[PDB]
Amino acid sequence: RKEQIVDCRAVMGLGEGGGLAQRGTFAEGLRNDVVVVAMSPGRRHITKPVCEITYGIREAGIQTSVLVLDAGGGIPSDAPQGSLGSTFGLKPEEAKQVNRHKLCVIHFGNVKSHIIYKARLFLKYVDIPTIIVCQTPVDMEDFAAIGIKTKNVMPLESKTEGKIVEIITGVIRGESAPQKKIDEIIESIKKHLG
Amino acid sequence: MYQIIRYEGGVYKNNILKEWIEDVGGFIIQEHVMQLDVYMTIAIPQNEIENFKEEAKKYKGKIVETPLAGIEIAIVSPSLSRHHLPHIACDVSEYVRKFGAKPNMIGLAHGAGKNISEIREKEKRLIQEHDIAIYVMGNFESCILDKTHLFKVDIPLVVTGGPETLDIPYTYVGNLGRRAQRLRKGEEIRALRQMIDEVTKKINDKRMELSYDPPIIPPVVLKDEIEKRIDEVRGILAPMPIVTQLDGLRIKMDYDRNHEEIENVKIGKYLLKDIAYVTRSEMKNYILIKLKSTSE
Amino acid sequence: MNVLVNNNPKSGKTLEDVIKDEYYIPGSNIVIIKGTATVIKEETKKYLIKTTKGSFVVGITEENETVDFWNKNYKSFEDKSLIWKSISDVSFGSIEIPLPVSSVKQNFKKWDVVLSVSGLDTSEGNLIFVQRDVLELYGLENPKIGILIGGKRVLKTLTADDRIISIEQMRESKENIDYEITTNLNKEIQDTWKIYTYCKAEFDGPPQSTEHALAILENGTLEISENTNTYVADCRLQTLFIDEENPEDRDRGTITVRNIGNGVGKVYIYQESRASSLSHTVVGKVTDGIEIVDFSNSGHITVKTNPERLSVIGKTQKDAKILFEKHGITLKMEGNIDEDAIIVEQVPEYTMDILKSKEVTTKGIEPEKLLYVEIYDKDAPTTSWYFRKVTGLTTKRIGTLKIYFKHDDISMFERDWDYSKGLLPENTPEKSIDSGIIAVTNMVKKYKGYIGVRTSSNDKYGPTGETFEGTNIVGKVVKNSEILKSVKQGENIYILEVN
């Protein structure tokens, strides 16, 4: 039980009846332990699956920062035959803001081929262990098939400097995460943090 | 002299508008580009307000009068748990942000309960470092009445709670209790507007007392001078690298490593250490600057 | 009749008479000032006082109706002794306060001007200058009228004996300046009217930016292209680059040159004291006669520069000799020494460098080596502007063209990959190009901006090896020739515009 002060973002939310967060913004939790990365400030990511994990970690006693990616939707441009619909990316300032935390928690969607390449591009510039929270059942290894460092399934030629440290499946976008998923995330964070 | 407003427009030809603002002597306090629209909190002299309105309407921009875009507010929630943080507290913080203020969530370590609630001295001082503090309390009259010891700071105070009317010896705004939904009903919006009006009145009163004995240099131009001189301010990863307070600034750089550089900054013909109180902040070991008045 | 002129009074009714002596290039504006108004306006939201214990500064905040009372009833509270200074704070009066004394008590804050009707008796309404935050203590709808901060100690020390005597306010005062802007001469002057004719500019800055400013003010007049409440700007040279930073305060009557952005090269004169800017290079100051700049919103202003521009490129050698000896500068010769030899290059070429070094090296050219050109400004405005910028004719009278590539009849000149941006096809040939035609390749071709000329005529290719659709004609060589065939690659030829 200790005081927890959060550096709120400097810009307001999405209109009047919309979300409270803004795209491409960062909210430091002073003491940098865990950063929760949200793909967008929309209802599919913000306060339904992301702020719930945030308050779960903050209830566990671990200070949390929430970073909303400027361009978190879509697949990276390095995906086979390029990207479609939208382009996923990470800014150098976003990477620096992530890299000062002990651990990262990132929320992904349902299509595996999207998740694997998004994680590869994310870990191309993030060097701290991260936890992937997605809906679909994805295996630790398909990330290693495209050259992602992974705790259980290493690749021969690692194309990322970041370690996928845990994968948690069953968290749906835009829906309230049950207490069991929060407990699993907290246990994984604790046993890969200290 | 420097009235602070928010400009909402597009990124196209925004550089020419920034050049115009620099030419007329204004300062761009805040800049954010979402996809194709840019929000700019700008402080320009009052004699160029109509000129800037004309210039903004040339770019099909929008001018929003922000009455709180010179202060930072400490929003004090009893905890950062699911009860207060993910709703009400964020609504209060975002509504404060909507009027230009820079909020900071203050989650008390032992702020929950009825008789087991307590506030530490470090949290007290951290709250006092701000301009105004907003307390987000519960929705039971007895619990709030038996919790008055929490609101003991010599800072302007606005207390929000569930019951419509409270009998505490402070400013109180009702119908904003502990909830679990996003504040979107008409009554909730009205209560948020009432809280905004109370904090605006307190800030205007404090502005008048400050204007009785004005500081030697305005905080906004001091921030501009620090940015021009100090070359480590663009390497700051914090949300607001330099916070503009009512009568000072908050520089989010390490105090032990940079206080000597900050103090030995020449503004006009004075050295900063002789016109401002540079001290370490309880906030992540940052640097806090308090401006002196012309009396000393 | 007897009027005051500048600092030396004249009388001539018509402007012409008094401005006859006053140096003025015809075409500029005339600023007249009439006088001052000195309007005294005071609202004193914050009120003053003159008690027998000193003077504190009250300040109305809570409108309620106590403010409405105070408005004029503070004058009835004038010369009222302190009634009580008990736990109920310091109180004064007590005068009639008809404000409905609602029993409903209210909470008040430390030092908050309060007009609590003491004893709920209208005529006993007390001016309770609150000292300590009193909670539900006084009746009235809401005694809180304002907040006391200034002179806090005064009301604290204030004892019963002491009265507020002269309840002051703030003597709020303002100033208005009459201005009229003119450019007539045959008008009647009544009496005691002040006229300003010109402003004096003092230049002290980096050499390139100061030379840019001097070239702007070479004719003595400064165009007013943009005007705000803080500055006036000139846009004659808005696409010319400079790389010099002089970031100090843009004070009253400061001359700056913008060195970066869309408006790089604009010359600003500031009418207000503003902060330093990294995008503005200060080149000097306006010493005396600021009001002509202050009251001019558009048109012309006659400017006199204290350091004369020492750049003799369009003159003969004897003119440079006499002008530089009249400034006491040591001289040495380089090229053509003839008294009529046309100067082509001078080292150093900047006025500040010349003044700080006190020596000039002047280079002349042979009469037959100078190339004479005519530039089509009406036919190809953008291309002619680019050609003037690249060859340097925007600043000096003699431009320099560098040979870039040569083959028999063709001689191509170097390009500037900084001014060749809007090179839209402007003056494209329709028939076979005749000899001695200067042309620039537009953005259509890969080698956009390269200038060239050929001494023969062909029906297919322009002077730069491109087809006609990729070439815009900017000008022609009129008089001097047979020097393009005897100049090697990399050598510079010098041109003179003859229109």
Summing up helix and strand content along with how strands pair, one would put the structural category of chain B as: alpha/beta
The proportion of residues in beta strands of chain B is 15-25%
What is the radius of gyration of chain C? Answer: 37 Å
What's the quaternary structure here?
Answer: part of a larger assembly
Protein name (chain B): Methanogenesis marker protein 7
Pfam families (chain B): MCR_C
Organism (chain B): Methanococcus maripaludis X1
InterPro entries (chain B): Me_CoM_Rdtase_prot-C-like, Menthan_mark_7
What this model shows, in words?
This is part of a larger assembly, with chains A (194 residues), B (296 residues) and C (499 residues). Chain A is of the alpha/beta class and 194 residues long. Chain A contains five helices and nine strands; from the N terminus they run E-E-E-H-E-E-E-H-E-H-E-H-E-H. In chain A, the strands form two sheets. In chain A, strands 2-4-3-7-8-9 form a six-stranded mixed sheet, sandwiched between helices. In chain A, strands 5-6 form a two-stranded parallel ribbon. In chain A, helix 1 crosses helix 5. By secondary structure, chain B is of the alpha/beta class. Chain B has helices spanning 14-23, 49-58, 85-97, 121-128, 141-145, 186-212, 219-229, 255-263, 272-275; strands at residues 2-10, 27-33, 37-45, 62-64, 72-77, 102-107, 132-136, 157-160, 172-173, 242-244, 248-251, 266-267, 270-271, 276-280, 287-291. In chain B, the strands form four sheets. A five-stranded parallel sheet of chain B has the order 6-5-7-8-9, sandwiched between helices. Chain B has a four-stranded antiparallel sheet with strand order 2-3-1-4. In chain B, strand 7 (132-136), helix 5 (141-145) and strand 8 form a beta-alpha-beta unit. In chain C, strand 4 (82-86) and strand 5 (89-92) form a beta hairpin. In chain C, the strands form seven sheets. In chain C, strands 11-17-10-16-14-15-13-12 form an eight-stranded mixed sheet, covered by helices on one side. Chain C has a seven-stranded mixed β-barrel with strand order 21-26-24-25-23-22-27. Helix content of chain C is 12%, strand content 26%. By secondary structure, chain C is an alpha+beta fold. Chain C contains eight helices and 27 strands. Chains in contact: A-B, B-C. At the A-B interface, strand 1, strand 2, helix 1 and helix 2 of A face strand 2, helix 3, strand 6 and helix 4 of B. It is classed as oxidoreductase. The entry lists the keywords Methyl-coenzyme M reductase, activation complex, ATPase, Iron-sulfur clusters, oxidoreductase. The entry is titled "Methyl-coenzyme M reductase activation complex binding to the A2 component".
